[PDB]
Design a protein around this ligand. Structure first.
Ligand SMILES: *[C@@H]1O[C@H](CO[C@@H]2O[C@@H](C)[C@@H](O)[C@@H](O)[C@@H]2O)[C@@H](O[C@@H]2O[C@H](CO)[C@@H](O[C@@H]3O[C@H](CO[C@H]4O[C@H](CO)[C@@H](O)[C@H](O)[C@@H]4O)[C@@H](O)[C@H](O)[C@@H]3O)[C@H](O)[C@H]2NC(C)=O)[C@H](O)[C@H]1NC(C)=O
Ligand code: PIO
Ligand code: PIO
Ligand code: PLC
Ligand code: PLC
Ligand SMILES: *[C@@H]1O[C@H](CO[C@@H]2O[C@@H](C)[C@@H](O)[C@@H](O)[C@@H]2O)[C@@H](O[C@@H]2O[C@H](CO)[C@@H](O)[C@H](O)[C@H]2NC(C)=O)[C@H](O)[C@H]1NC(C)=O
Ligand code: CL
Lengths: 510, 459
C-alpha cells in the first residue's frame, strides 16, 4: 500500500479501487446488536474528548471556537469520513496536538494584531493546496521515516502538556478566587464573577480530583477480577462517562456554590455570536486582513499538515497492523487527503480541522472486533456515532450543567492514560528503578544500563528543547523542531550509538 | 550507653507511638469536651511505657491507646452524659474495680479463657474496629460540613472565641481536602515502600515514616494557607490538663461538682468487666508470661484512671539473651520518655489540623483490613469462583459453604453494629465475646469439622 507507484494520485486511486467494491457489504454487514453496542461505546468515547477540548479552546480563544463548533465539525466530518473514507473505523476528532497548535496560533495572532479566525481560513486554503500537491507525488512513504523515536517524543510531550495545562488552569482558578478571610459578597457575575468568591477554588479542585480518581478507579476495575466479568468490562468501558456523571451530580446538588460551567449556546449557534457568524469572510471580519499574511500563512499550514500527517498516519499504520487482522483495504493517501481537505473547508467555516486520532480509532476497532476471529467492519456505526455527536449540541440543558473542573479532571486522566504505552515513559521510570529491577525487555538485556540512560537522556533533552520552543514567542515552530528529531535519529544517534543498541532502543512493533 | 542503631530504631518506634497517640488524643478530646485529650493521653502513654519497660516481663510489647479503647471511652462518655454522671469520676471508680479485678484474678490460676478465643472472634473484632474507624472519619467530615455549610453569603465578623460561632467559608472544603490529601499521601508512601523505585535503603526508610511524612506535608499545606480557618489540636502549654476549667490532675472519687451516686460506685463493676474483656482481647490478638503483662497493663490502667488519664492496652510487638533484654528495656524507656516530652512541643502540635488526623484515622482503618481473612472472603463474595486464590479454605470448602460462613460472620458484625448504635453500647465487649460460644457450639452443628478447621485456622 505504501509503495511509490510513480503515477500521479497512484495511492489514492489504488485505495479507492480497493475499497469501493466492499461498500454495500459495509452498509449491510452491521446487521447486529454488536454494532448497536459499539455505537454507544464510541459515542461517549468521542463526546468526552470533544467537550473537554471544546471547553479548553473556548476558554483560550474567548469562544471564537468552542464546544458547539467542535461538536458540529466532528459530526459533519465524521459523516463525510463514514461515507467516503477508505478506513471507516478511523474516528476523526480533535486531538491534543491540534489544541496545542491552536493555542500557539491564537497567541501569535494576538501578539501580531491579526484576526485569528481569518488566519485560520487562509491556513485552511494553504492546507488544501499542500495536500493536493503531496498526494500528487506520494508523500505517505515519508511515514516510514517517522520512527518510534519521534512518535514517543510527540506523545510524551502531548501528555506533559495536558498535565501541565490542567494544573495551570487550576492554579488560575485559585488565583481568580483566592482563599480569603472575607469576601465582598453580592459581587456581580453577568459574564463571570467580578471578584473572588468563597468555596469556588476548593470546590473546583475537589471536583477535578474526584473525577480523576473515579475515572482511574473504574479503569482499574475494568482489569480487575470482580463481578461476572462481562459486566466488569461493560462498566470499565463506561468509566469516564460514569465519573463525569457522578461529579456533575455532586456539583448539581451543591446549588449555593458557584463553579464555572461549559459555555454552550441553546441550539445550532456559534459560541460567541458577537465575535463571528457561521461563515468567515476570507478578506476580514472587522478589519482588512494583511496581504503579507495571506502568502505568509503557508508555514503554519505546513506545520499543521505535519501534525495531522504524523498523528493520522501513525494511527493508520497502527490499525493496519496485520496482527489486528484488518481485512479489506485501508488507505493512507485517501485518509490523509480527506482529513486535511475537510479540515481546510472547516477552517473556512470557522470550525476546527480534525485528525484521525489513535486512541478512539483503536477503541472502535476493539469494540467492533469478535473474540481474534475477525473484525466487523462497517460504515454504519461511525455514521451513527457522528450523527449522535451532532445531536449532542441539541442537549444544551445537560451540557451547561457540566463544571469545567470535571472536564479538567478528564483532561488529566486522558494525559495520564496516554502516558501508558510509551516506551520513553518506561525508560524514564527505569531511570529511578535500580538496575536489579529492570524488566526483561530487549533494550534492558541487550544494552548496557548507562547507554540506555544516555539514550533516554538525549530524548529528555529533545523534550526540554521542544518545551522551551513551546514557551518562547516562536511557539508555532514546535512541529518543525519535532520533525528535526528524524534527522537526529537517522544521522547523529548512529555516531553516538552502535547499530544493535539502536535496533533494541528504537524497535518498531517491539 | 545508646548505640547509633539503638537511636535509629528509637526514632521509628517513637514516631509509630506518637502518630496514633496524637490521632486518638485529638479524637478523644473532641468527643469528651477535653476531659481527656492529647495531653492526658501523651502523659499516660509516657508514664505507663516507662513502668512497663522497667517492670513488664515482655519488653518488646508496646503499650498505648487503641481503637477499642477509644470506642469504649466514647460509649462510657455517652452513658455518663445520658445519666448525668461525672465522666472522669466514673472512670476513677472503673479503675478501682479494675485493680480489684486484677488482684482477684491474680489469686486464681486463670489461663482457661485464652484457649477459647479463636481467629473467628479476633477477625470479627478487627473488622468491626476498622469499620468504626472509617465510619467515624466520614461522620466527622459530615459534621464539619454541617457546622460550616457551603452557602452564597457568610457573616463578616463571626466570633472566633472559643470556636467559630457561625459558618465560615472554605473551612469544610479545606478540611475535606486536607484529610483526603493526608490519606492519599499515606497510601502512596505505603505503596512506595513495597515498590521497585529508588535505592532500597532510602525506599524502606521513607516507607517506614510514611504517616509522619504525610502529616508533615499536609500540616505545611495548611500552614501556608493563612486566611482559612481549620480546627486544630487543643494542646495545653506544658504538663497540664486540656481544660483546667473542668478538672485538675488528681480526681476526687466522691465527686468534683456533683456527688457521685452511691449506686454507680457498685454498677461500675460491669464497665470494669467490659474494659477487662476488651484489653484482654487486644492483648491476646497482639501477643499471639502474658498473664503478668496483661495484669500489669490492667492495674496500671486502673491506677491511671484516678488521675483522669486513659488506661492503655498492649498493642503489639515493636520493630546473649540478657543483652537483647536490656536493649529492649532501654529502647522502651527512651521511646516512653520522648512521648512524654512531646507535650512540650505545643508550638508544633497546635498547628496540626484535625482534618489531617482524620485522614490518618481513615488510613489506619483501611490498612488494618489487610491480613484479615474475613475481609478476604468478603472480597471473594464479589468475585467469580474461578479467580478465588489457592488457599486451604477455598480448595477444601465448597464455595457456597464458605459464603454461608462469611454471611454468618457478617450477621455477627451487623449485630455488633446495632448494639453499638443503641444506648446499650457499653455492652459491646460482652456481645463480642458471645461469638466464642457461637464458634464452639452452633458452628459445629451447621458446619463439618474439616470446613471449620480450614475456614477458622490457628495459623
Ligand atoms: C473544658 O470544660 C468546660 C467546662 O465543662 C463543664 O464542667 C465539666 C466538669 C463537666 O461537667 C462538663 O460537662 C461541663 O460542661 C467546657 O465548657 C463547656 O462547653 C460546652 C460546649 O460549648 C458547653 O455546653 C453547652 O452548655 C449549655 C448548657 O449549660 C448551661 O449552663 C452553663 C453554666 O451556667 C452556662 O454557661 C450555659 O450558657 C448554659 O446556661 C447549652 O448552651 C448547650 O446545650 C451546651 O451543652 C458547656 O456549658 C460548657 N460548660 C460550662 C460550665 O460553661 C469546655 O468546653 C471544655 N474545654 C474544651 C476546650 O472543650
Ligand atoms: C534522593 C536521590 C537519591 C540519593 C541517592 C543517590 C542514588 C543512588 O545512590 O543510587 C545508587 C543505586 C546503585 O545501588 P545498587 O544497584 O548497587 O543496589 C541495588 C539496589 O539499588 C538496592 O541497593 C538493593 O536492592 P533492595 O531494594 O535492597 O532489595 C540491592 O542490594 P542487595 O540486594 O545486594 O542488598 C542492589 O541490587 O542506583 C539505583 O538504584 C538507581 C537509583 C536511581 C534514582 C537516583 C536519583 C538520584
Ligand atoms: C450488580 C449485580 C451483579 C451480580 C449479578 C449476578 C450475576 C451472577 O450471579 O454471576 C455469578 C458469578 C459467577 O459467574 P460465572 O462463574 O458463571 O462466570 C465466570 C466469570 O464470572 C466470567 O463469566 C468469566 O470469567 P472472565 O472474567 O471472563 O475471565 C468465565 O466465563 P468464561 O471464561 O467461560 O467465558 C466464568 O468463569 O458470581 C459472581 O462473581 C457475582 C459476584 C457478586 C456480585 C456482587 C454485585 C454487587
Ligand atoms: C493536596 C494539596 C491541596 C492544596 C490546596 C491549595 C492550597 C493553596 C491555596 C492558596 C490559594 C490562594 O491564596 O490564592 C491566591 C494565590 C496567590 O495570591 P494572589 O494575591 O491571588 O496572587 C495572584 C494575584 N492575581 C489574582 C491578580 C493573579 O494563588 C496561588 O498561589 C494559587 C496556588 C495554589 C494552586 C492549588 C493547586 C494544587 C493542586 C494539587 C494537586 C491536586
Ligand atoms: C471523600 C468523600 C466524602 C465526602 C463527604 C462530604 C460530606 C458532605 C456533607 C453533606 C451533608 C450536609 O450536612 O451538608 C451540609 C449542607 C446542606 O445544606 P442544606 O440542605 O440547606 O442544610 C444546611 C445544613 N444542615 C445540614 C446542618 C441543615 O450543604 C453542604 O455543605 C453540602 C456540601 C457537600 C460537598 C461535599 C463534596 C463531596 C466530594 C466527593 C468527591 C470525593
Ligand atoms: C465574545 O467576543 C467579544 C468580542 O471579541 C472581540 O471581537 C472579535 C471580533 C475579535 O476581534 C476578538 O479578538 C475581540 O476581542 C469578547 O469581548 C472581549 O473580551 C475581551 C476579554 O476580556 C476584552 O478585553 C475585550 O475588550 C472585549 N471586546 C469587546 C469588543 O467587547 C468576549 O469576551 C467574547 N465572549 C466570550 C464569552 O468569550
Ligand atoms: Cl483524542
Amino acid at each position: 500500500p505504501l509503495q511509490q507507484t510513480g503515477q500521479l494520485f497512484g495511492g489514492l486511486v489504488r485505495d479507492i479501487r480497493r475499497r469501493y467494491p466492499y461498500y454495500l457489504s459495509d452498509i449491510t454487514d452491521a446487521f447486529s446488536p454488536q454494532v448497536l453496542a459499539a455505537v454507544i461505546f464510541i459515542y461517549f468515547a468521542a463526546l468526552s474528548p470533544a467537550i473537554t477540548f471544546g471547553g479548553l479552546l473556548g476558554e483560550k480563544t474567548r469562544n471564537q471556537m468552542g464546544v458547539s463548533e467542535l461538536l458540529i465539525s466532528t459530526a459533519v466530518q465524521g459523516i463525510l469520513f463514514a461515507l467516503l473514507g477508505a478506513q471507516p473505523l478511523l474516528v476523526v476528532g480533535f486531538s491534543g496536538p491540534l489544541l496545542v497548535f491552536e493555542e500557539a496560533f491564537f497567541s501569535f495572532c494576538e501578539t501580531n494584531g491579526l484576526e485569528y479566525i481569518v488566519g485560520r481560513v487562509w491556513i485552511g486554503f494553504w492546507l488544501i493546496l499542500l495536500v493536493v500537491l503531496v498526494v500528487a507525488f506520494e508523500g505517505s512513504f515519508l511515514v516510514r521515516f517517522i520512527s518510534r523515536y519521534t512518535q514517543e517524543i510527540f506523545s510524551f510531550l502531548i501528555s506533559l502538556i495536558f498535565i501541565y495545562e490542567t494544573f495551570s488552569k487550576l492554579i488560575k482558578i485559585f488565583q481568580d478566587h483566592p482563599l480569603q478571610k472575607t469576601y465582598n459578597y453580592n459581587v456581580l457575575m453577568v459574564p463571570k464573577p467580578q471578584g473572588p468568591l468563597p468555596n469556588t477554588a476548593l470546590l473546583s479542585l475537589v471536583l477535578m480530583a474526584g473525577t480523576f480518581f473515579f475515572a482511574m478507579m473504574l479503569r482499574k476495575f475494568k482489569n480487575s477480577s470482580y463481578f461476572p466479568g462481562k459486566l466488569r468490562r461493560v462498566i470499565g468501558d463506561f468509566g469516564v462517562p460514569i465519573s463525569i456523571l457522578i461529579m456533575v451530580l455532586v456539583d448539581f446538588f451543591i446549588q449555593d456554590t458557584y463553579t464555572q460551567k461549559l459555555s454552550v449556546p441553546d441550539g445550532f449557534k456559534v459560541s460567541n455570536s458577537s465575535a463571528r457568524g457561521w461563515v468567515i469572510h476570507p478578506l476580514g471580519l472587522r478589519s482588512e486582513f494583511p496581504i503579507w499574511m495571506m502568502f505568509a500563512s503557508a508555514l503554519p499550514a505546513l506545520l499543521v499538515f505535519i501534525l495531522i500527517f504524523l498523528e493520522s498516519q501513525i494511527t493508520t499504520l497502527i490499525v493496519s497492523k496485520p496482527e489486528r487482522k484488518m481485512v479489506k483495504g485501508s488507505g493512507f493517501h485517501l485518509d490523509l487527503l480527506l482529513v486535511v481537505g475537510m479540515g481546510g473547508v472547516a477552517a473556512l467555516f470557522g470550525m476546527p480541522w480534525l485528525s484521525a486520532t489513535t486512541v478512539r480509532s483503536v477503541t472502535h476497532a476493539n469494540a467492533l472486533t469478535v473474540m481474534i476471529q475477525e473484525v466487523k467492519e462497517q460504515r454504519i456505526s461511525g455514521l451513527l456515532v457522528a450523527v449522535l455527536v451532532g445531536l449532542s449540541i441539541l442537549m444544551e440543558p445537560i451540557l451547561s450543567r457540566i463544571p469545567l473542573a470535571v472536564l479538567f479532571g478528564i483532561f488529566l486522566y486522558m494525559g495520564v492514560t496516554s502516558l501508558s504505552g510509551i516506551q520513553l515513559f518506561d525508560r524514564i521510570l527505569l531511570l529511578f528503578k535500580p538496575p536489579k529491577y529492570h524488566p526483561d525487555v530487549p533494550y534492558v538485556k541487550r544494552v548496557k544500563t548507562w547507554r540506555m540512560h544516555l539514550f533516554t537522556g538525549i530524548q529528555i533533552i529533545c523534550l526540554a528543547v521542544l518545551w522551551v520552543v513551546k514557551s518562547t514567542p516562536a511557539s508555532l515552530a514546535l512541529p518543525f523542531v519535532l520533525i528535526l528529531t528524524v534527522p537526529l535519529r537517522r544521522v547523529l544517534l548512529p555516531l553516538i550509538f552502535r547499530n544493535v543498541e539502536l535496533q533494541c532502543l528504537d524497535a518498531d512493533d517491539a
